[PDB]
Structure 1
Amino acid sequence: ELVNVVDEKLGTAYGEKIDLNNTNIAAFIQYRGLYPTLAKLIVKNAPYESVEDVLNIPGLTERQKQILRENLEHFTVTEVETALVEGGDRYNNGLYK
């Protein structure tokens, strides 16, 4: 009844895709065209009901929409986990090299 919610989140798609609702912003560097600019937008406009909501971020250039489309299969959304989004941890989670 006492669960580590972070470990439990590694058993979800959070453990295999970039989770648009939870993943730190540094993960948007593993796919091209996404960092810093779209990463910044995705994070600020979170949370997302489903992966396809990213395309409804206002202000998107059609080039930006193309890159997001190109990468939707690398995204997921799970429920927001407080522990991963509090403390500005999506912008800086304590991990460098």
Structure 2
Amino acid sequence: ELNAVDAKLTTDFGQKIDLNNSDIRDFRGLRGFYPNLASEIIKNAPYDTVEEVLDIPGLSETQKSRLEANLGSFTVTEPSIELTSGDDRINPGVY
């Protein structure tokens, strides 16, 4: 039987950046995201749809344009507590 993160990997979480589960290092690929915008996204998770990553309080023009230019890199899956508990989305133990 597959455990929950392996099953998550069978879904879209394995293809694109997941706004609800992907750790802060997965946002390094989008220019201008790591660390501040990725931090704000991880802080305001969960998200019900990718589009509402634009409705984070306090976001400025640059961050909004940056999020809209990369909406297609984003997917949203149910928050799995196997990737979020213990601040794993900031430091999963990977250096």
Q: Mark the runs of 5 or more structure 2 residues left unpaired by the alignment.
A: none
Counterparts of 1:35 and 1:94, CA distance in 2: 17
Deviation at 1:63, TM superposition (A): 1.2
User: Is 1:79 the equivalent of 2:73?
Assistant: no
Per-residue CA deviation, residues 24-62 of structure 1 (Å, 9 max, x unaligned), is 001110110111110010000000000011100011111
Paired position in structure 2 for 1:66: 65
Deviation at 1:3, TM superposition (A): 3.6
User: Is 1:47 the equivalent of 2:56?
Assistant: no
Paired position in structure 1 for 2:23: 24
| TM-score of the superposed pair, with normalisation by structure 2 | 0.96
Percent of pairs with identical residues? 56
One-letter code aligned to 2:17: I
Which of structure 1's runs of 4+ aligned residues deviate more than 3 A?
A: none
| TM-score of the superposed pair, with normalisation by structure 1 | 0.94
User: Is 1:38 the equivalent of 2:37?
Assistant: yes
How many aligned positions are there? 95
Paired position in structure 1 for 2:7: 8
Counterparts of 1:17 and 1:55, CA distance in 2: 18
**What value does the CA root-mean-square deviation take over the aligned residues?**
0.8
SS in 1 for 2:69: helix
Q: Mark the runs of 5 or more structure 1 residues left unpaired by the alignment.
A: none
